[PDB]
């Protein structure tokens, strides 16, 4: 009973994003078995190669939904209790035993986000970490140089630190790398042939969109940010995928294929973000103008803005990508793909 997707409106969104500084922008809709696919602009601005909806890209913080699915399958298996203390599983990690796994997964832990220090200056910060390899503990120690910012559970405050903890939990409780767990629990069963976790490798396998970091100086030249370790994010940000594979993943999630019903319900217990948005457990809700809510996640790793959202039953999914970042006009414009794709023509 959804409106038809509006391709003319999608086309206008991409064209606007280009006019605001995205080298390329694209979107794929899987509408209950009917595909919509549009792209405009360039995957590589120096060579001129066109962007296309099959280009792989860095999904950034969409990674948190993959990490959350692994953790919730561990809850299904009896290996993890969401209301247990992080420090019960990782003794001595955090300065407060009251911080629970559920709080970290919903950004209610109070843990300071180290990435504000790292990327205070956008391009210098990128140059500082792009070729660094961090352990999970290194990143937690960077957070803990600062006090928590709120009491456990008390407020929503997004922090990459939370999903660094998530990766440490995954590796401790399984004895495997997050790469292995993602592959065995998600990428292989869903046949996500364009989806990878290669950290700390800097190469994007196969044909990909290059990423272009916008400098903090208005009008400044773009920086190619395609090749980096993403070691500053890991289980908070380092998955590589495609529009088809993120559509498959969020459709599978919402249609109940990736965990028990009970754990999907836990994943959708919404913490208020604003009057039109919530945060579950590694999962975002956005409320659209026509009265529809959609479910998924955004990403903003250097040079790539991703939106990947599905309807409640998974039957319609949409993934949009612009290959720039640090450009709020572009970021806001690309959100409009969800309106056109789900709410259709005005
Ligand atoms: C995941 O991708 C992760 N991203 C990074 O860790 C990269 C990075 C780069 C520099 C500094 C810090 C981190 C997180 N992603 C996202 C995301 O997907 O959006 C985060 C949420 C980011 C912030 N969003 C808001 O502040 C949204 C407010 C909300 N409300 C309305 C009604 O106003 C809304 O707009 O929906 C955020 O920081 N936004 C800015 C614009 C931003 O993303 N800045 C970076 C530099 C960019 O534009 O590239 C948290 S990090």
Q: Locate the domains of the chain by residue range.
A: 1-346
> Is the C-beta atom of 337 inside 6 A of ligand 1?
no
Size of the chain in residues:
346
d(CA 323, CA 306): 9
Q: Which residue ranges make up the annotated binding site for substrate? A: 119-122, 158-160, 284, 298-300, 325-326
> Is the C-beta atom of 280 inside 6 A of ligand 1?
no
The distance of Cα 315 from the centroid of its chain, to the nearest Å, equals 20
> Is the C-beta atom of 20 inside 6 A of ligand 1?
no
Q: Assess contact for 123 and 214: CB atoms under 8 A.
A: no
Using DSSP bridges, classify how beta strands 324-325 and 212-213 pair: parallel, antiparallel or unpaired: parallel
Query: Which protein residue's CA is at the shortest distance from atom 50 of ligand 1?
Result: 158
Query: Which protein residue's CA is at the shortest distance from atom 45 of ligand 1?
Result: 326
Q: State this model's resolution in angstroms.
A: 1.2
> Is the C-beta atom of 325 inside 6 A of ligand 1?
yes
Distance, CA 33 to ligand 1 centroid (Å)? 32
Spatial CB neighbours of 307, under 8 Å, sequence gap ≥ 6: 296, 298, 318, 319, 320, 334, 335, 337, 338
Using CB atoms within 10 Å of the CB of residue 250, give its burial: 0 to 12 exposed, 13 to 18 middle, 19+ buried.
Answer: buried
C-alpha separations of 178 from 39, 136, 226, 344 in Å: 32, 11, 22, 38
- The number of helices, as runs of H, and strands, as runs of E, in the chain is 12, 13
d(CA 287, CA 340): 13
Q: Which CATH class is domain 1-346?
A: alpha beta
Distance, CA 174 to ligand 1 centroid (Å)? 31
Spatial CB neighbours of 157, under 8 Å, sequence gap ≥ 6: 107, 108, 110, 113, 149, 150
Distance, CA 79 to ligand 1 centroid (Å)? 32
d(CA 59, CA 204): 12
- Please report the atom of ligand 1 found closest to the CA of residue 301: 7
Active site residues: 61
3-class SS of residue 70? helix
Q: Which residue ranges make up the annotated binding site? A: 119-122, 158-160, 284, 298-300, 325-326
Please say whether the dihedral angle defined by the alpha carbons of residues 137, 160, 117 and 126, taken in this order, is positive or negative. positive
d(CA 154, CA 152): 6
Q: How was this structure determined?
A: X-ray
Using CB atoms within 10 Å of the CB of residue 78, give its burial: 0 to 12 exposed, 13 to 18 middle, 19+ buried.
Answer: exposed
d(CA 127, CA 6): 40
Q: Assess contact for 24 and 333: CB atoms under 8 A.
A: no
């Amino acid at each position: 009973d959804l409106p038809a997707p509006d391709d003319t409106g999608l086309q206008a969104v991409l064209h606007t994003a280009l006019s605001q500084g995205a080298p390329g922008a694209m979107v794929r809709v899987d509408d209950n078995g009917t595909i919509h696919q549009l792209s405009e602009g360039v995957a590589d601005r120096a060579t001129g190669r066109a962007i296309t909806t099959t280009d792989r890209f860095r999904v950034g913080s969409v990674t948190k939904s993959f990490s959350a699915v692994v953790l919730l399958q561990l809850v299904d298996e009896g290996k993890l209790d969401l209301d247990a203390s992080v420090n019960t599983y990782l003794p001595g990690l955090l300065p407060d035993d009251r911080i629970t796994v559920r709080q970290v997964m919903s950004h209610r832990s109070g843990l300071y986000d180290y990435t504000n220090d790292m990327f205070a200056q956008t391009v210098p910060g990128f140059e500082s970490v792009r070729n660094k390899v961090f352990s999970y503990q290194d990143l937690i120690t960077l957070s803990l140089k600062h006090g928590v910012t709120n009491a456990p559970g008390a407020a929503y405050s997004y922090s990459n630190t939370n999903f660094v903890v998530a990766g440490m939990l995954i590796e401790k409780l399984t004895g495997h790398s997050v790469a292995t767990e993602y592959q065995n629990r998600i990428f292989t069963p869903l046949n996500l042939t364009d989806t990878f976790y290669v950290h700390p490798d800097t190469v994007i396998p196969g044909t990909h969109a290059n990423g272009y970091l916008t400098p903090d100086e208005a009008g400044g030249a773009l920086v190619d940010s395609t090749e980096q370790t993403v070691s500053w994010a890991q289980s908070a940000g380092a998955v590589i995928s495609s529009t088809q594979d993120l559509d498959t993943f969020f459709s599978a999630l919402m249609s109940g294929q990736l965990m028990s019903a009970a754990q999907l319900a836990q994943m959708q217990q919404w913490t208020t973000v604003n009057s039109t948005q919530g945060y579950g457990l590694g999962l975002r809700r956005r409320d659209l103008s026509c009265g529809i809510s959609v479910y998924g996640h955004t990403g903003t790793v250097q040079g790539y803005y991703t939106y990947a959202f599905a309807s409640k039953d998974g039957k319609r999914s949409v993934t949009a990508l612009a290959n720039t970042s640090n450009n709020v006009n572009v970021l806001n414009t690309m959100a409009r793909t969800l309106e056109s794709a789900f709410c259709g023509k005005p």
